Amino acid sequence: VGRVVVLSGPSAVGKSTVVRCLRERIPNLHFSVSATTRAPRPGEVDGVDYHFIDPTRFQQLIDQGELLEWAEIHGGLHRSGTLAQPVRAAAATGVPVLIEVDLAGARAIKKTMPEAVTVFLAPPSWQDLQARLIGRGTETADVIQRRLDTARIELAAQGDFDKVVVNRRLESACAELVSLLV
């Protein structure tokens, strides 16, 4: 039976390079393919990039409890979320599953699938995360202040998760996640 790992963390702690590393290290890792009600962009493939469904069918899925989590996107322009059945089927086949979601999505998945392992990718320090949020200083002071406030709130949540991986170094963050997945 494959492990299901839900990866989340602060907005902008470094999740997507980590995801790429994981998919290279585990040849058959199944990266959860979200359902969405937006239309496909050219180059997106149904079943690979997203499962493209219509709003009515997406509402049916909500009502039948077939989503582990879902959210309104861009204030309700459309919806996206994680389908339960492919995750469960992949796991029953013995293939490991990774789901990457924001913190609200991870909280939702722990309710709908408690056997999933939730992991919070934490920064090695406050100053490391603050430095990245300031960045090249292209944003206004109000925008940066809001980002720092948001980060402190999100960091307060790391206790809600099954595991904390500290992103000290890409190779060892990725290594710890590999150990969790296989």
CA distance 78 to 63: 17
CA distance 122 to 129: 9
Last residue of a domain, one of 46, 67, 95: 95
CA 176 to chain centre: 17
Burial profile 151-174: b = 16 or more Cβ within 10 angstroms, e = fewer:
beebbebbeebebebebeeeeebb
Is 75 annotated for ligand binding? no
In this structure, the answer to whether residues 128 and 174 fall within a common structural domain is: yes
Is 12 annotated for ligand binding? yes
CA distance 42 to 73: 20
Query: Can you spell out the DSSP letters for 14-38?
Result: SHHHHHHHHHHHSTT-EE---EESS
Last residue of a domain, one of 54, 69, 95: 95
In this structure, the answer to whether residues 101 and 163 fall within a common structural domain is: yes
Is 124 annotated for ligand binding? no
Last residue of a domain, one of 67, 95, 123: 95
In this structure, the answer to whether residues 101 and 17 fall within a common structural domain is: yes
CA distance 90 to 29: 10
In this structure, the answer to whether residues 178 and 103 fall within a common structural domain is: yes
In this structure, the answer to whether residues 180 and 100 fall within a common structural domain is: yes
* Token pair belonging to 42: 């050219």
In this structure, the answer to whether residues 27 and 39 fall within a common structural domain is: no
Is 16 annotated for ligand binding? yes
CA distance 45 to 59: 22
Sheet with 163-166: list strands edge to edge: 30-31, 97-100, 4-8, 117-122, 163-166
Query: Can you spell out the DSSP letters for 107-136?
Result: HHHHHH-TTSEEEEEE-S-HHHHHHHHHTT
Is 14 annotated for ligand binding? yes
Is 9 annotated for ligand binding? yes
Domains in the chain, number: 2
Is 94 annotated for ligand binding? no
Beta strands 67-73 and 51-52 are unpaired
Which residues constitute the domain of residue 118?
A: 1-32+96-182
Method underlying the structure: X-ray
Residue with tokens 């969790």: 180
In this structure, the answer to whether residues 19 and 44 fall within a common structural domain is: no
Residue 160 φ/ψ, nearest 5 degrees: -75, -15
In this structure, the answer to whether residues 110 and 177 fall within a common structural domain is: yes
CATH number at residue 127: 3.40.50.300
CATH number at residue 46: 3.30.63.10
Which among 46, 20, 22, 23 is positioned nearest to 35, based on CA atoms? 46
In this structure, the answer to whether residues 101 and 13 fall within a common structural domain is: yes
Experimental resolution (Å) = 2.1
